[PDB]
């Protein structure tokens, strides 16, 4: 085996175990603030933040052909000056180490218009042409066109708690989101082949975009947990 | 703190850390077989099995007024000779140590017709008068009338994987069930106050009933995991 | 695999997950008090206490021939009215489920004069004919005659912290005792074959005796931790 | 809290979560080989290897004034062409992120002749003027002059297993080394104040040197484990 794992109940400004890209930063108040905001705290359009964890993860193994199993979780929120007009979303993902930001807005900073090898779970607020009705949750295997999605019952300014799981044995990825304040929950599950989708080593992180021409909503990540196993 | 936790990938016949009630037994093949069956393997009506874990759990504390947080999981299946005619269901629960079986069939062995202090998560196959349309999943706080339920997309003879969580801090209980074979999943969540619902010490286990006049479906528990924390 | 594990930072009077034998009891003040004492708090001679954990442990497996690996720890102390005159000792051990107390004093309640299948780590204060000079630590495989022992640098009324390990793979048992207050430590290690020494299922606990004709020292167990794994 | 932790049962050549300094490298055969050797496999004098783990560790906190507790372990060996002539040693340590190698041989690559803020546990084979008789184990707080040491019963070409612990609460560091093949073990313990000794963030790793004018012994690290907690 080969294992790793970490937990933070807060973000520490300037923490060396993290890598901030784009607009992303950490507040004195221990928030991971992915997008840029007004003094009033209002979001700025055409914004983009990413955040990754420094140590790369050994997700699969060529010789052995072994596949890691992982799990992650994190508390997060959003702020929408106007809830009738949201965009663009937030995502948790896995990418090559070298990873850098891609297209914004609708592409959630993870994908570029044409065809990085990315695996992602999206929390989408905005109906692109490829999107389904309503904000939803989706699995993204090398495309902004989710292989599966599900209605997401978002709640502005309220804390959502998230759970992600990868069962190597079934090759089945599961995502669940719960809002304790509203006693509400959504889940989603599908199969993903790590191997054909990613490099043996990856980096994980968060991505988030605001509306192109609109402010839509900010995206703050409050806490974060991760564990992984890779067997013999 | 005070913690406990256990995991089994199989059941061992005659294992001393378990307590079998009613029809319940463990197969040579490491299954926990809750209800009785034909040679052909068909279920016998009016059957009832319970199974508990020996060590009692310290779920809450009077002096401190502290509340445990727990989580559990287990792989399970069902066998329905005839899928048009199912009953009665399966449940995971928490009860007083002294606990013994109650009414069968529709009462899932946990509750008696009139008004034990029981907390349960049910997997219900049968529309009682108190039930909602379709097999579902529900939270049972001292009553067979779920405070909340959700459509359960059962699949006969297929393995379902289950997850239960209790967040003391939010007092929010979450139940998720996933069927990897069908890439299908359901979740459900609501608040439950341990304190007002149960004794400081409890025992946990499984309950399962067959149709009164029908065979409906058997209920086998394949594996089992549990962890709990009780703080200062 | 098959795993279990538990931790207590205090003892709860009347806790159902424990079994008290002999003089042993739990104080309002959360101590596990193995031997009997004066109002003044002085120990009573010819005293004997044992304490076990309720759930039995699956230490080895016949079919598979698999062996568990475990580890334990606990904070403990002793009280000697007169340090020139100590007896008799304290022990942590593994026994058959059925286990009941044996001979006292020098036999630490675990062994009887002539030849239960017991494995124990002793903290011996008293030179029996079979003992070596000075209080020591020893490994006891079915005999009060340690297969190995080591000088123990005891310190009255001071808290000692203990560590026990069993590496199934090497079949090597290790015991370390440290006294933080005095920046002092002892270790001891040797091989033990679980299989030939014990039953597939065992119960673990503590034993402790006072001097036959003397008071010697009391033995209180403050905290306790245990984890075990048994593989496929 | 804030936690991290990792385990490897082998080293992967070119693994990105590690940083190799000096002569240090990883063998096809998954060894971490700290010093340089002959084709015959014999060690080369005046050699030096270091190895660190990439992610930095948050060992203590200014605001809170909280101190982490950690533990580590690793399997290691040594090869001495001639056991009458050994040098120079191996060490596990904590340093500033920026850390780079210091003086070799007797200084184990961690310290320079005159007075980096380093905390280390040494496995010393060579009697310097500051050393005590015999190979030993020692605690090094900002000096190659151990604040405490203990006889180390080394065994050439044999696998030693090591354990390191830091109890923030007692501020007591413990080191134990065991050689299963020989049923032999050594322990050592003393207090160390993280705060006054190191920066809030540190990097951990291994260091190892060969004899100045002699080959002495090689130093290979086989496996490695680490966990840390930093509280609120
Ligand atoms: Ca979209
Ligand atoms: Ca029903
Ligand atoms: Ca004795
Ligand atoms: Ca030296
Ligand atoms: Mn979408
Ligand atoms: Mn129902
Ligand atoms: Mn003895
Ligand atoms: Mn030295």
Cα separation, C66 vs C58, in Å, equals: 10
Contact A9 D56 (CB under 8 A): no
CA of D123 from ligand 2 middle (Å) equals 67
Measured between alpha carbons, how far is residue B90 from residues B35, B87, C130 in Å?
A: 10, 9, 59
Cα separation, B54 vs B224, in Å, equals: 14
Cα separation, A145 vs A113, in Å, equals: 12
Alpha helices, H only, C45-138: none
Cα separation, C108 vs A112, in Å, equals: 74
Instruction: Tell which residue, C30, C29, C23, C25, has the closest CA to residue C45.
Output: C23
The residues, any chain, with a CB within 8 Å of residue A166's CB and separated by 6 or more, are A68, A69, A70, A71, A172, A173, A174, A192, A194
Cα separation, C190 vs C174, in Å, equals: 7
Cα separation, A207 vs A120, in Å, equals: 10
Cα separation, A231 vs C186, in Å, equals: 36
Partnered with residue D47 across adjacent β-strands are none
The residues, any chain, with a CB within 8 Å of residue B182's CB and separated by 6 or more, are B153, B155, B158
**Residue D168, phi-psi category: left (phi > 0), alpha (psi -120 to 50), beta (remainder):** alpha
Composition of chain D by helix, strand, coil, percent to 5: 5, 45, 50
CA of D126 from ligand 4 middle (Å) equals 4
Cα separation, C225 vs C227, in Å, equals: 7
Residues of D in contact with C176 (CB under 8 A): 176, 187
The residues, any chain, with a CB within 8 Å of residue B49's CB and separated by 6 or more, are B20, B21, B22, B23, B24, B25, B33, B34, B35, B36, B109, B206, B207, B208, B219
Instruction: For chain A, say whether B75 makes contact (Cβ under 8 Å).
Output: no
Contact D185 C187 (CB under 8 A): yes
CA of C106 from ligand 3 middle (Å) equals 5
Residues of D in contact with A16 (CB under 8 A): 55-56, 97, 201
What determination technique applies here?
Answer: X-ray
Measured between alpha carbons, how far is residue B159 from residues B31, B41, B74, B77 in Å?
A: 13, 17, 10, 5
Planar angle of CA B14, B19, B20, nearest 5 degrees? 80
Cα separation, A104 vs A113, in Å, equals: 10
**Beta strands C48-53 and C18-22, pairing class:** antiparallel
**Residue A91, phi-psi category: left (phi > 0), alpha (psi -120 to 50), beta (remainder):** beta
Instruction: Tell which residue, B53, B61, B52, B54, has the closest CA to residue B2.
Output: B61
- Phi and psi angles of residue C226, each rounded to the nearest 5 degrees, phi first: -155, 140
CB atoms within 10 A of CB C153: 16
Cα separation, B203 vs B57, in Å, equals: 6
Ligand nearest to the CA of C123: 7
The residues, any chain, with a CB within 8 Å of residue A82's CB and separated by 6 or more, are A215
**Residue B41, phi-psi category: left (phi > 0), alpha (psi -120 to 50), beta (remainder):** left
Complete DSSP assignment for chain A: -EEEEEEESS--TT-TTEEEEET-EE-TTS-EE-S-B-SSSPBPTT-EEEEEESS-EE-B-TTT--B-EEEEEEEEEEE-S-TTS--EEEEEEEE-TT------GGGTTT--S-----EEEEEE-S--TTPPSSSEEEEEESSSS-SEEEE----TTSPEEEEEEEETTTTEEEEEEEEGGGTEEEEEEEE--HHHHS-SEEEEEEEEEE-SSS---EEEE--EEEEEEE--
Contact B187 A187 (CB under 8 A): yes
Secondary structure (3-state) at C133: coil
CA of A85 from ligand 3 middle (Å) equals 80
Q: What is the CA radius of gyration of chain B?
A: 17
Cα separation, D209 vs D131, in Å, equals: 16
Q: What count of CB pairs under 8 Å joins C to D?
A: 40
Cα separation, A63 vs A46, in Å, equals: 43
Cα separation, D54 vs D51, in Å, equals: 9
Cα separation, B98 vs A135, in Å, equals: 48
Q: Is residue B125 within 8 Å of residue B216, measured between CB atoms? A: yes
Cα separation, A101 vs C183, in Å, equals: 53
Partnered with residue B204 across adjacent β-strands are B94
Q: Is residue B17 within 8 Å of residue C55, measured between CB atoms? A: yes
Partnered with residue A32 across adjacent β-strands are A26, A221
CB atoms within 10 A of CB D15: 18
Measured between alpha carbons, how far is residue C104 from residues B106, C205, D146 in Å?
A: 56, 16, 45
Residues of B in contact with C17 (CB under 8 A): 4, 55-56, 58
Interface of D with A in 6-35 (CB under 8 A): 6-9, 12, 15-17
Cα separation, B86 vs C98, in Å, equals: 44
Cα separation, A189 vs B180, in Å, equals: 8
Q: Is residue C78 within 8 Å of residue C154, measured between CB atoms? A: yes
Q: From the candidates B7, B95, B96, B230, which should be mutated to test the interface with C, based on the most C CB atoms within 10 A?
A: B7
Residue with tokens 């090689």: D218
Instruction: Tell which residue, A170, A229, A200, has the closest CA to residue A60.
Output: A200
Q: From the candidates D71, D147, D152, D178, which should be mutated to test the interface with C, based on the most C CB atoms within 10 A?
A: D178
DSSP state of D197: H
Contact C7 B8 (CB under 8 A): no
Tokens read off for D60: 């203590």
Cα separation, D35 vs C109, in Å, equals: 53
Q: Is residue B198 within 8 Å of residue B38, measured between CB atoms? A: no
Q: Is residue D54 within 8 Å of residue A57, measured between CB atoms? A: no
Measured between alpha carbons, how far is residue D57 from residues B149, D19, D95, D102, D203 in Å?
A: 45, 14, 10, 21, 6
Q: In chain D, which residues are last before a break of more than 2.5 Å from C to the next N? A: 115
Q: Is residue A48 within 8 Å of residue A23, measured between CB atoms? A: yes
Strands (E) in chain C, as ranges, are: 2-8, 18-22, 25-26, 32-33, 48-53, 57-58, 69-79, 88-95, 119-124, 136-141, 148-151, 160-167, 172-179, 184-191, 201-210, 218-221, 224-230
Nearest CA in chain A to B177: A187
Tokens read off for A49: 């933040």
CB atoms within 10 A of CB B150: 19
Q: From the candidates A69, A184, A189, which should be mutated to test the interface with B, based on the most B CB atoms within 10 A?
A: A189
Name the helix (H) or strand (E) containing D194.
helix D194-197
Instruction: Tell which residue, C122, C135, C137, C141, has the closest CA to residue C191.
Output: C141
Nearest CA in chain D to C182: D190
Q: Is residue C173 within 8 Å of residue C191, measured between CB atoms? A: yes
Cα separation, C123 vs B158, in Å, equals: 54
The residues, any chain, with a CB within 8 Å of residue C88's CB and separated by 6 or more, are C104, C105, C106, C108, C124, C125, C126, C209, C210, C211, C212, C216
Biggest alpha carbon distance in chain B? 54
Nearest to C5 among B5, B15, B201 (CB): B5
Q: Is residue B94 within 8 Å of residue B202, measured between CB atoms? A: yes
Q: Is residue D139 within 8 Å of residue D93, measured between CB atoms? A: no
Instruction: For chain D, say whether A1 makes contact (Cβ under 8 Å).
Output: yes
Given a contact as 3+ CB pairs under 8 Å, which chains touch B?
A: A, C
The residues, any chain, with a CB within 8 Å of residue D232's CB and separated by 6 or more, are A9, D1, D64, D66
Cα separation, B82 vs B217, in Å, equals: 8
Residue D162 to chain C, least CA–CA distance (Å): 12
Residue with tokens 């609708």: A106
Given a contact as 3+ CB pairs under 8 Å, which chains touch D?
A: A, C
CA of A44 from ligand 5 middle (Å) equals 21
Secondary structure (3-state) at B128: coil
Ligand nearest to the CA of A91: 5
Residues of D in contact with C174 (CB under 8 A): 178, 185
CA of A159 from ligand 5 middle (Å) equals 21
- Phi and psi angles of residue A71, each rounded to the nearest 5 degrees, phi first: -150, 150
Cα separation, A22 vs A39, in Å, equals: 19
Residues of D in contact with A4 (CB under 8 A): 5-6, 17
Residue with tokens 């190659």: D144
- Phi and psi angles of residue C197, each rounded to the nearest 5 degrees, phi first: -105, -20
Chain Cα centroid distance, residue B11: 16
The residues, any chain, with a CB within 8 Å of residue C28's CB and separated by 6 or more, are C13
Residue with tokens 């069962």: A167
**Beta strands D218-221 and D32-33, pairing class:** antiparallel
Contact B180 A190 (CB under 8 A): no
Chain Cα centroid distance, residue B198: 16
Measured between alpha carbons, how far is residue C173 from residues B182, C70, C75 in Å?
A: 47, 9, 19
Burial of B9 (0-12, 13-18, 19+ CB in 10 A): middle
Q: From the candidates B6, B203, B227, which should be mutated to test the interface with C, based on the most C CB atoms within 10 A?
A: B6
Cα separation, B77 vs B89, in Å, equals: 11
Cα separation, B136 vs B148, in Å, equals: 10
Instruction: For chain D, say whether A170 makes contact (Cβ under 8 Å).
Output: no
Nearest to D54 among A1, A5, A55 (CB): A55
Cα separation, C12 vs B228, in Å, equals: 17
Cα separation, A55 vs A226, in Å, equals: 12
Contact D8 A2 (CB under 8 A): yes
The residues, any chain, with a CB within 8 Å of residue A29's CB and separated by 6 or more, are none
CA of A149 from ligand 5 middle (Å) equals 7
Partnered with residue D174 across adjacent β-strands are D165, D189
Nearest CA in chain D to C171: D180
Instruction: For chain D, say whether C170 makes contact (Cβ under 8 Å).
Output: yes
Q: Between the CA atoms of D75, D81, D85 and D87, what dihedral angle is there, to the nearest 10 degrees?
A: -40
Q: In chain B, which residues are last before a break of more than 2.5 Å from C to the next N? A: 115
Cα separation, B126 vs B105, in Å, equals: 9
Nearest to B172 among A170, A180, A187 (CB): A180
The residues, any chain, with a CB within 8 Å of residue C11's CB and separated by 6 or more, are C18, C26, C27, C30, C31, C32, C221, C222, C224
Instruction: Tell which residue, A19, A58, A72, A69, has the closest CA to residue A226.
Output: A72
Q: Is residue B224 within 8 Å of residue B164, measured between CB atoms? A: no
Contact D180 C186 (CB under 8 A): no
Instruction: Tell which residue, D129, D118, D174, has the closest CA to residue D150.
Output: D174
CA of D162 from ligand 4 middle (Å) equals 19
Residue C179 to chain D, least CA–CA distance (Å): 9
**Beta strands D160-167 and D48-53, pairing class:** unpaired
Chain Cα centroid distance, residue A70: 15
Cα separation, B25 vs B194, in Å, equals: 30
Q: Is residue D206 within 8 Å of residue D50, measured between CB atoms? A: yes
Long-range Cβ contact pairs of A166-169 (< 8 A, separation 24 or more): A166/A68, A166/A69, A166/A70, A166/A71, A166/A192, A166/A194, A167/A69, A167/B180, A168/A67, A168/A68, A168/A69, A168/A194, A168/A231, A169/A69
Cα separation, A205 vs A120, in Å, equals: 10
Planar angle of CA D164, D165, D166, nearest 5 degrees? 140
N- to C-terminal Cα separation, chain D: 5
Instruction: Tell which residue, A26, A29, A66, has the closest CA to residue A49.
Output: A26
Q: Is residue A117 within 8 Å of residue A96, measured between CB atoms? A: yes
Planar angle of CA D132, D76, D145, nearest 5 degrees? 25
Instruction: Tell which residue, A190, A191, A161, has the closest CA to residue A176.
Output: A161
Residue C181 to chain D, least CA–CA distance (Å): 8
Tokens read off for C35: 């031997």
Biggest alpha carbon distance in chain A? 54
Tokens read off for B18: 């378990």
Burial of C84 (0-12, 13-18, 19+ CB in 10 A): exposed
- Give the domain ranges of chain C: 1-232
Cα separation, B66 vs A72, in Å, equals: 27
Instruction: Tell which residue, B110, A217, B113, has the closest CA to residue B123.
Output: B110
Contact D183 C174 (CB under 8 A): no
Cα separation, B130 vs A68, in Å, equals: 45
Q: Is residue A153 within 8 Å of residue A136, measured between CB atoms? A: no
Strands (E) in B27-127, as ranges, are: 32-33, 48-53, 57-58, 69-79, 88-95, 119-124
The residues whose Cβ lies within 5 A of ligand 2, an ion, are B 106, 124, 126, 128, 131
Residues of B in contact with A184 (CB under 8 A): 189
DSSP state of B37: B
Query: A and B: touch, per 3+ CB pairs < 8 A?
Result: yes
CATH topology for the B1-232 domain: Jelly Rolls (2.60.120)
CB atoms within 10 A of CB B108: 28
Residues of D in contact with C167 (CB under 8 A): 180
Cα separation, D103 vs D112, in Å, equals: 5
Instruction: Tell which residue, D68, C227, C93, has the closest CA to residue B3.
Output: C227
Contact A7 D8 (CB under 8 A): no
Measured between alpha carbons, how far is residue D48 from residues A122, B225, C116, D84, D106 in Å?
A: 48, 48, 55, 21, 11
Q: In chain C, which residues are last before a break of more than 2.5 Å from C to the next N? A: 115
Residues of A in contact with B178 (CB under 8 A): 172, 174, 187, 189
Give resolution in angstroms.
2.5
Q: Is residue A48 within 8 Å of residue A101, measured between CB atoms? A: yes
Query: C and A: touch, per 3+ CB pairs < 8 A?
Result: no
DSSP state of C196: H
Residue with tokens 């007009």: A85
């Amino acid at each position: 085996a080969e294992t790793v794992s970490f937990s933070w109940n807060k973000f520490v400004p300037k923490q060396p175990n993290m890598i901030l890209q784009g607009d992303a930063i950490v507040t004195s108040s221990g928030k991971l603030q992915l997008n840029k905001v007004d003094e009033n705290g209002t979001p700025k359009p055409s914004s983009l933040g990413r955040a990754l964890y420094s140590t790369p993860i050994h997700i699969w193994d060529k010789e052995t052909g072994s596949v890691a199993s992982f799990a992650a979780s994190f508390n997060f929120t959003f702020y929408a000056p106007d809830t009738k007009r949201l965009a663009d979303g937030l995502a948790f993902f896995l990418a090559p180490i070298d990873t850098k930001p891609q297209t914004h807005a609708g592409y959630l900073g993870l994908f570029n218009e044409n065809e990085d090898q990315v695996v992602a779970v999206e929390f989408d607020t905005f109906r692109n042409s490829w999107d389904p009705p309503n904000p939803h949750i989706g699995i993204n295997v090398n495309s902004i066109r989710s292989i599966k999605t599900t209605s997401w019952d978002l709640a502005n300014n309220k804390v959502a708690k998230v759970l992600i799981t990868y069962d190597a044995s079934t090759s089945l990825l599961v995502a669940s989101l719960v809002y304790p304040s509203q006693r509400t929950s959504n889940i989603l599950s599908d199969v993903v082949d790590l191997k054909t989708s990613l490099p043996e080593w990856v980096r994980i992180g968060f991505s988030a975009a605001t509306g192109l021409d609109i402010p839509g909503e900010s995206h703050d990540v409050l806490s974060w947990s991760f564990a992984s196993n890779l067997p013999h």
